[PDB]
Design a protein around this motif. Sequence first.
Motif, PDB file in Angstrom:
ATOM      1  N   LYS A 121       1.699   6.441  -7.130  1.00  0.00           N
ATOM      2  CA  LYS A 121       0.662   7.331  -7.634  1.00  0.00           C
ATOM      3  C   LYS A 121       1.139   8.774  -7.727  1.00  0.00           C
ATOM      4  CE  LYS A 121      -3.468   4.705  -6.379  1.00  0.00           C
ATOM      5  NZ  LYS A 121      -4.662   4.634  -5.492  1.00  0.00           N
TER       6      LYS A 121
ATOM      7  N   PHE B  95       0.822  -1.206   0.000  1.00  0.00           N
ATOM      8  CA  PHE B  95       0.000   0.000   0.000  1.00  0.00           C
ATOM      9  C   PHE B  95       0.859   1.260   0.000  1.00  0.00           C
ATOM     10  CE2 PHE B  95      -3.015   3.078   1.855  1.00  0.00           C
ATOM     11  CZ  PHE B  95      -4.078   2.883   1.000  1.00  0.00           C
TER      12      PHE B  95
ATOM     13  N   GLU C 272       2.376   1.710  -3.456  1.00  0.00           N
ATOM     14  CA  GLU C 272       1.380   2.198  -4.406  1.00  0.00           C
ATOM     15  C   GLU C 272       1.073   3.674  -4.187  1.00  0.00           C
ATOM     16  OE1 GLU C 272      -2.055  -0.276  -4.273  1.00  0.00           O
ATOM     17  OE2 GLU C 272      -1.093  -1.962  -5.299  1.00  0.00           O
TER      18      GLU C 272
HETATM   19 NA    NA Z   1      -3.357   2.388  -2.556  1.00  0.00          NA
END
Ligand code: NA
Lengths: 558, 558
Positions: free
Chosen positions: B163, B156, B159
Amino acid sequence: RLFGGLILDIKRKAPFFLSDFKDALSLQCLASILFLYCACMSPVITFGGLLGEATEGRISAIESLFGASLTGIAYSLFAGQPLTILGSTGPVLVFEKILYKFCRDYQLSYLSLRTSIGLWTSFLCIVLVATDASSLVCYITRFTEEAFAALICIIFIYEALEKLFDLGETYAFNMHNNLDKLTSYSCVCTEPPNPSNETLAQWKKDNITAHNISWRNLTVSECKKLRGVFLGSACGHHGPYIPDVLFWCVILFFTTFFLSSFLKQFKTKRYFPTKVRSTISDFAVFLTIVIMVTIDYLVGVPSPKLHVPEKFEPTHPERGWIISPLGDNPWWTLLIAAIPALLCTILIFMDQQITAVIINRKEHKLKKGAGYHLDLLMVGVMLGVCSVMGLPWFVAATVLSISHVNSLKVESECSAPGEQPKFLGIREQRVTGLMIFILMGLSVFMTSVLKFIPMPVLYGVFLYMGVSSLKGIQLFDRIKLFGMPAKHQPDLIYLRYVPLWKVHIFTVIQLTCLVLLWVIKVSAAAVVFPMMVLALVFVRKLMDLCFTKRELSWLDDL
Amino acid sequence: RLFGGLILDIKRKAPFFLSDFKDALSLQCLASILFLYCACMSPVITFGGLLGEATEGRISAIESLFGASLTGIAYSLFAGQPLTILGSTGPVLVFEKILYKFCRDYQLSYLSLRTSIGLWTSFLCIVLVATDASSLVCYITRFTEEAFAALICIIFIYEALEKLFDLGETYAFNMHNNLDKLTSYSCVCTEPPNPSNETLAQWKKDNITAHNISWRNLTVSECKKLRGVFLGSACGHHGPYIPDVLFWCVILFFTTFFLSSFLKQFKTKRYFPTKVRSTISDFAVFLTIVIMVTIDYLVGVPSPKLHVPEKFEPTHPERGWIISPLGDNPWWTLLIAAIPALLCTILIFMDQQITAVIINRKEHKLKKGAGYHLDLLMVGVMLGVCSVMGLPWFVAATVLSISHVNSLKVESECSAPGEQPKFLGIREQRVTGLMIFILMGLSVFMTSVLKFIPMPVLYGVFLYMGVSSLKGIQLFDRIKLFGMPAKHQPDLIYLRYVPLWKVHIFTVIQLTCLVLLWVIKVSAAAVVFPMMVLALVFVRKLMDLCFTKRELSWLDDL
Ligand code: NA
Ligand SMILES: *[C@@H]1O[C@H](CO)[C@@H](O[C@@H]2O[C@H](CO)[C@@H](O)[C@H](O)[C@H]2NC(C)=O)[C@H](O)[C@H]1NC(C)=O
Ligand SMILES: *[C@@H]1O[C@H](CO)[C@@H](O[C@@H]2O[C@H](CO)[C@@H](O)[C@H](O)[C@H]2NC(C)=O)[C@H](O)[C@H]1NC(C)=O
Ligand SMILES: *[C@@H]1O[C@H](CO)[C@@H](O[C@@H]2O[C@H](CO)[C@@H](O)[C@H](O)[C@H]2NC(C)=O)[C@H](O)[C@H]1NC(C)=O
Ligand SMILES: *[C@@H]1O[C@H](CO)[C@@H](O[C@@H]2O[C@H](CO)[C@@H](O)[C@H](O)[C@H]2NC(C)=O)[C@H](O)[C@H]1NC(C)=O
Ligand SMILES: *[C@@H]1O[C@H](CO)[C@@H](O)[C@H](O)[C@H]1NC(C)=O
Ligand SMILES: *[C@@H]1O[C@H](CO)[C@@H](O)[C@H](O)[C@H]1NC(C)=O
Ligand code: NA
Ligand code: NA
Ligand code: NA
Ligand code: NA
Ligand code: NA
């Protein structure tokens, strides 16, 4: 007797002269040198440029560099406490501003009058050393040596932040642009309709014809020189908007501070060897500078850079380095110049002595003794030399000296079952200042390398120094957690022996004085600002009234 | 018997039904709702947009919003542990892509086959609930429940960082510009010389004449649509450079995380009242969002914003919300669609059960008991309903559920005698999830307000959640300070009773498994990723060999 205190100080300091040089054979000395070289250069260049602007090009940056190098070398070689870093003080820049216009108002020569004033100030400083007035240091208590420090550190932090806030005016971005209409986004230089007859006069004495000149090629600087008008969709107050330079500067400024704070905390980590937890933990602000310079070079955005002068000859083409006290002035200006000398001598004496008192605090556990008479004597001697040579004046700086002292701290080895190695002492030496002020004088040869250092990195280093210098002051230990906050208290031995409301009143007394100092700091009396050290002592004397002497020298004291 | 576990779970959960609603009458409930609404919306919209792109406009964002709202409401109202937040998983956006080429390469209808597969998956889930296979939860130990948490949290965080890194491609800045030549800095659209015969075909079927069209006005989007060529000094790979948007996004992203971390630390401060140290310390990430949105609005730089769909009718103009299993397909596709249903049911079962095991850990001190059979039953029922209505599939999400649990922690009010307030328990309730998933379904009416939320703020919130979810896992407590580092150790009761090298080997065993999970996470088997929970148990079984059972169930299974 005469010169008795100077003889006593020389006798005290003579035994440790060789140890002062021999104790500088470690890595932390080089770490401190590399830390402080960059942090001490930038104020010198900025002050030199400002003084050159104010004096129409008489005292520029090169003279400031040479004067700082000479004064620092001759102070580190022969003085008392060698951990004091001499540095160009803002206040001075005030003293010239009134002076030059004065020399412009009547019909006087600036350099000769300034040299006479400096020579008489040096003579008065030598007389003060002879009288042994530095014994007045016995009157300064913790009350002042813990307010003045807090005020100076807060002012330094605010100045570091203001230097970043200033960047927004020069590099103005566009607050409202349409990302779909970038095909119609340009600035163009066009000739100004019905230009002012002033500009016509300018063109005529420059022999500038409006008709023949091509206007669609003139760049921003040429357009501003020729007084053109910008007409486009990207125009601003004056000049095209500068894309993505301000926010890159903000990123640099904050990333430098955060990275330095992170790197200066590996002395608490445990998942590393003992030679890697004290080699990148004492080199925290020199690794940061290199990393951020490399990142800025790789990204390539044209942020402001550090400009070090390349020439070695003086700025004005006729400034051969010597200035006789009188060469183009009546003989009575020498006898009149002594009047400001008393005020200047008093001001410099008070500034230097309060800095020396702050540095020689008992909490630093100084082993080699300190002397106050020799400091003032050598400061006066170099003030006279700098005034004769035509160089700016240099006195002690508080934040720089505190950061110099904090960079040579020696800590013990254990800490996990205990904590933060107990502070054993300040590494006492003389090579660090000498090397710093030697490297400052040689910056004229390394211009090609110093040009890659962006200014926001230096501002972040200034902010880090200002924040880190706060740690240690006793004032905050009350101010932080006594006046308003909560009910329960920490140990704080002074409470172990006194009422709480008394502590509240004591803190309020200091806060009111600090606020008064801040208010009269800028005012119209910034000229005579440090003279206020003569006022806090009076307040301290007028405090035994509604304070029993026990509470007085239990909650203050030390 | 049949359905015995479901009856037992219903009997256990029935007494606390009214208390579950009555316990939600505090401010921290509203704080959690406002925290999680924004952090749960963005993945739903992103997944909906990606699936709509992959399915040629069949399952867009609005269907994802409606499905998430329905599933969340019917799960919060009637389920077991109500602190589990159902969320759109990434794995699926792969099935619903391959299943598209297929229905084309051959000649099948996508919606009908997908509905048949979903219905059979729901039937298999109901059968699994009937068989009472969730008792296999008894086989999962602390070993897995502390890797599959660490791996998910690390993924997480990565990611969330990726992003932000992605934003640099869309908004490309100029790496080398001259600030003096801004008068010659513009992009211009010009007609393309000898354009490709493909573009000629495009123009002909669009009836586009090259000659008459004005090229010097076409904007960036129109130029890209008409396939023009950019010719200027500000051109890039494709399109004019975007000034100062990327660095503003970086500043937003990092400032949001730092401000949230600072604001979530006023429960340790002491210079404030007790009603101000627990009202802006439990509202740390909702005050941050408002402050950063206000700052972004005041600055005015056009950063990317959150786009919530405004229409209410389905995306495809012929998508009236019902999908019969067979309407344009041969009757044997129903009997063939059952083959992927077994794999889908197994995968969903394992994901939901590992999430339920992670959430119901003994360290959270759950008072109201939890049930696993009812969770799976209702997940299967809503999976079938969503498949029939033509809505995307939703299963439990680990990071979101952990952040939901951590936001309802109840702490004591005594830190002076001892230390940081001892954790007393998780506030057990059902109103938070119901309100979150009600507000998610009503976002179609509040589009005018949600359009002011920039995306980097949400990415910073995602990074903060990912970092904060790490705190608590036992793995790190070894991984951080055992394998390599130093010699001395903390207390760590498990050492109070075992060899150090054994602990090292134990940590290495877990690390190798985590690395294997990371390597095969993307691979070509991301389809069947969670099935690996069937592999860590086998390794745990094959660990009693070179481990005495005492060391085994002293260092390992808690
Ligand atoms: Na995420
Ligand atoms: C400002 O420019 C104007 C325009 O050339 C000039 O104004 C002249 O001023 C003088 C007196 O100072 C008059 O005798 C002229 O007749 C004015 N010119 C015109 C065209 O009327 C002058 O160069 C500037 N003004 C001043 C006051 O110096
Ligand atoms: C700016 O100066 C240049 C130099 O003469 C001219 O603009 C163009 O420059 C390029 C490169 O040197 C050449 O194609 C021609 O010299 C110019 N092209 C033209 C005029 O079409 C011109 O004198 C100036 N530009 C303007 C707009 O006045
Ligand atoms: C690509 O555009 C060219 C240019 O109009 C075309 O090429 C023609 O190709 C056909 C055979 O496919 C020939 O009979 C023509 O003689 C070609 N044109 C010329 C001018 O030589 C055609 O529109 C496109 N090429 C293809 C292969 O479709
Ligand atoms: C772009 O379209 C406009 C609209 O006709 C034209 O450019 C100028 O637009 C302004 C404002 O409408 C007016 O002064 C004239 O309409 C145009 N001025 C000119 C042509 O000198 C023009 O048709 C297009 N621009 C270009 C460069 O082709
Ligand atoms: C303008 O012309 C005069 C005489 O024609 C000449 O002396 C002068 O140098 C010219 N201006 C410049 C800047 O050269
Ligand atoms: C192009 O022309 C044809 C016939 O002249 C016409 O039917 C068509 O609508 C035109 N193209 C467009 C985009 O209108
Ligand atoms: Na200062
Ligand atoms: Na400063
Ligand atoms: Na000072
Ligand atoms: Na996850
Ligand atoms: Na999951």
